Design a protein around this ligand. Sequence first.
Ligand SMILES: [Mg+2]
Ligand SMILES: [Mg+2]
Ligand SMILES: [Mg+2]
Ligand SMILES: [Mg+2]
Ligand SMILES: [Mg+2]
Ligand SMILES: [Zn+2]
Ligand SMILES: [Zn+2]
Ligand SMILES: [Zn+2]
Lengths: 220, 195, 89, 37, 129, 56, 63, 151
Amino acid sequence: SQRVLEEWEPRTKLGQLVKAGQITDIHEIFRKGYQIKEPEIVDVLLPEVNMRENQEVLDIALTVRMTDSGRRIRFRVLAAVGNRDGYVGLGIGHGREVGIAIRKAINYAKMNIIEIKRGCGSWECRCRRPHSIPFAVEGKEGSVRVKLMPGPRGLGLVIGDVGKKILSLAGVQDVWSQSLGETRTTVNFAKAVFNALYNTNRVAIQPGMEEKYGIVVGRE
Amino acid sequence: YLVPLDQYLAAGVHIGTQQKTQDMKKFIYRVRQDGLYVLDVRKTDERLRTAGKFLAKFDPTSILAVSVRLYGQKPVKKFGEVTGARAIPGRFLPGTMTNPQVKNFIEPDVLIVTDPRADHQAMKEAIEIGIPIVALVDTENFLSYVDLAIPTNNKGRKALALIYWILAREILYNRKEIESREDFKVPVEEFEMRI
Amino acid sequence: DPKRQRKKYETPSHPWIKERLDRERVIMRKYALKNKKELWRHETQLKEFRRRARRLLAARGKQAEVERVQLLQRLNRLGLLPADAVLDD
Amino acid sequence: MKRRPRKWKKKGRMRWKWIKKRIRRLKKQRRKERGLI
Amino acid sequence: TLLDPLANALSHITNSERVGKKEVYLKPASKLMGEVLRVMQENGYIGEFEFIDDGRAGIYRVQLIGKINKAGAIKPRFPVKAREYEAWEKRFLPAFEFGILIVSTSQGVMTHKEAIEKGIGGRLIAYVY
Amino acid sequence: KFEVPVCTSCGKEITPREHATHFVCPNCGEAIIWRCESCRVLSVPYKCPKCGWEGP
Amino acid sequence: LPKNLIPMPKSRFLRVKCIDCGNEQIVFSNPSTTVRCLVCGATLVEPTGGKGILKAKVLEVLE
Amino acid sequence: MARMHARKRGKSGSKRPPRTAPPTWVEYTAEEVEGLVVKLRKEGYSAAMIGTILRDQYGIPSVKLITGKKITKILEENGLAPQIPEDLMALIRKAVNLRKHLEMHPKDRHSMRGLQLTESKIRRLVKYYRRTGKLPAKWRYDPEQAKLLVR
RNA sequence: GCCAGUGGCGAAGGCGCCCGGCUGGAACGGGUCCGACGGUGAGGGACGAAGGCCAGGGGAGCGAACCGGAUUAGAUACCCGGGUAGUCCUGGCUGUAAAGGAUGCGGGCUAGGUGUCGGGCGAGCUUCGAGCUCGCCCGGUGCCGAAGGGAAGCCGUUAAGCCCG
RNA sequence: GCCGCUAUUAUUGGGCCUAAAGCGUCCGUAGCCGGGCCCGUAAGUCCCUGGCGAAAUCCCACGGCUCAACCGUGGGGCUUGCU
Ligand SMILES: [Mg+2]
Ligand SMILES: [Mg+2]
Ligand SMILES: [Mg+2]
Ligand SMILES: [Mg+2]
Ligand SMILES: [Mg+2]
Ligand SMILES: [Zn+2]
Ligand SMILES: [Zn+2]
Ligand SMILES: [Zn+2]
């Protein structure tokens, strides 16, 4: 986006390329080992992430440190951002104030952006269009064990509110879940969902399965 | 067949260590009755040729060579002054590759660590970037996160000077910054510490 | 152990979801409905259509083909789908 | 006895050896007043 | 003790695929291990397998190609009529025609797909996806 | 669309934020060796498809 | 492929001749019994925990 | 193979190489090999000892490879195979000697356990050999009858 | 006793002066024999530290109970001096323990490094020693450790990993 | 009060070092699990077919009470199955 691009000086090799007009697509950003240390990169190549909608704050916790002279409180903020196609990121941010924590969490989210596979793999849609995920997938963080299953079109997101938010930002409209562990731990629940969505890429396939499951790696 | 054989063996390149590694027994030629393993100079020579081609295809300033070890601190410095190859002899200064808020922030395209166990810092920062790692490895080195390996004593003043001298020569040869290799002028004694 | 006539509408799993409430409030004002009961009745109609369609996707012939045809011609007759329609629709 | 390491802990408890000994004294009294007196 | 060379073979393949090995060796070979590998080759999960012969039960050398996520034995070798594969798929596989359930039938060892197109059931013995 | 790269060792379709690496074949050029994180950290040898230079 | 595939013997059968009669005789390198010449009764290999210690093989072969 | 009462994963043993045909360096034919087997059984050697001697002295690997038959098959053909099988016999002799020791040494409970395990093995093999016919069905281990048996 | 050890043997409990006798089990080596004889085991049985009990002996030291001296506000204790049972032997009963690797047993797979015990192999050295050093194989016993696992601590080819029971 | 929530009964699908939880250890009976090849049988298993598993109830379409509920026509399913 031109707006941030003007104000932005890159500071990184990747940012130099982006500014220079090279690496014009976030797909060219990803699967190369590259190091993203710049939400400005992500905003340039994915401007819909700059939007208050398409941003989601998922948890705010007041955490305590003890000292002589009493309690010193910090704010942990779990935020997610995403383009409602196939890109989503998740970040934690800490601050002495909630607003600092929020902007930091969103920056780290844009840095932790990932690219996911979308499709249709349920026995009872077979629509070959990317409303769900193409195959069941699993993820974990802490005690939380999230198992996402493809669902039919119009089902909705059969998952807790955190997963609803993250999957909406990632463009998944329909899904079934089975969960284990402590889902009342929002951080680890969210990371488990996130890691499942990345395991969509970790899973292997055969040639024709792309066509039959409607597999889509980013935008459609 | 460069640098015939006795210059290698005088530098002590074939000399390994009492410890071994299965990642490196491919290169280990034998073990002698004292418990010390010996590397194959033929493989050393081959891998040096390939490293030369590789780093020649790379851009000069994008090359970074690090050496915590002092015996390599000097010849890495000379390698840099010869090739344009971002020498880091001292301590790596954690954040050189990852924190853009350091003074000397470097985002290279390849890395020439002299010993991975001593340069574990640079290794993991390069890992995070996703750049290749060329490494000098002795019989006790693991090949984790090493995309090109060169067998070497990697603890000797000599043999470090010689390996870096050979690399510089082969890089310039493959860049055509020199014609036939004998047109190289620099001495190994210049690459060496000489205490 | 007999029949026991059952409701033909389903109530929501949670009564106080802000999203569902807003959505349903809008629908009820737009279509001038007396009852959430009435809305949920039509939602349940839809749900049953969808479940049949699902089953018949994941079904095999000589029956479940009859029911495919029956579903589609019923929905055509009701005016929810065109005649060239499918379970995807 | 069947015992419980949980009981062996002391966070809000009396020592289990001595709880045990008390239990056994009680049991002895009961056995004593049951069968012969 | 040793029980089900087939399960051991499949678990070995699974673990070797996780660590990126190119070839595995399956030591207490069997005609069943061979049929299962025939099927896995035909459906494109492994590459090339050859029977090495010792004086013992024989070995299989199996060249992999990086197309296995989970391969395993359905060890209660479950009887399955020709119209229950939907359910067993939903239990063992992630999407509707993703992997392969291997079925022993009276007409040989087959995939559930071939079993369906033949209208014959049998006993489930393995899954691969 | 765009293509997804694939390791020369594992053949397992490199992922977005993997600590992977890519570089041309030494002794061949003309070939992009892709190398996944698992393969790098476990010292899984590769081999150029055009040439047969093995490498770590 | 190496050293466990098709586990093969390290022992060898080897042809020896006694010093007294000179009859060539096949034997085993890792014997459990003192091996005696079939003609003279002379010990050709004395048993040990492993590889037997060989007497009387000055002209030797191994298969 | 301390397994079965010690659970050590010992691997000591023989490594027969795969051989579809006999070796060419071998001198003896099936017939004279059989003759040697019979000779040694008359000398009083068990089948295991016979194979050991034919391996060490005569350079015969695998009488089975040579003849196509086993040593106990050869013995039963020439009417020399043991009445009860050798392994069982060996266990019974051990048990009897140990019974004697334990009568003169009642407090050697560790050797008593060794006896228990020995008799357990006996019972196992008896079960198997009854099932396969190498013993009558009515056969049963008993210490005193086994003493008479050995003696 | 010192030697005596992340040492060894043993199912565990546990086992240390030497010599002789009887005896158990394991590892290694093994082109030896048998030919699936295997695993686990409800129930059932055997073994099972200290302590305690029955009977009979013995009784140095230590020593519950007890007896005295102190201490202390008190001191049914800690400290001191004594001291019964007991600790030892014989034969029995008891059948409990932080009986703990707080980790049931078997089998297959998933990087290794470095020690150490035992056997074997190959080299080198030797004062030519049942000697020393190096390497390799098998089996034990430890530390570390990538991947991996896990709530984490930590585990990590002696799994708390994947699979088969 | 029952189901669900509850993968807090776990076949699917739970756990047992430190949180509840590996018998003190071993031995072994029933039971369960069982290496590889060949031949046979065809008991389980699978396919096809005959006879049964009432009606109502369940699903679907179509018709009649204004529609619906209800009722009828027909198709299918259900009965643990047995043969
Ligand atoms: Mg550790
Ligand atoms: Mg409960
Ligand atoms: Mg639980
Ligand atoms: Mg506990
Ligand atoms: Mg009926
Ligand atoms: Zn790979
Ligand atoms: Zn190449
Ligand atoms: Zn002679």
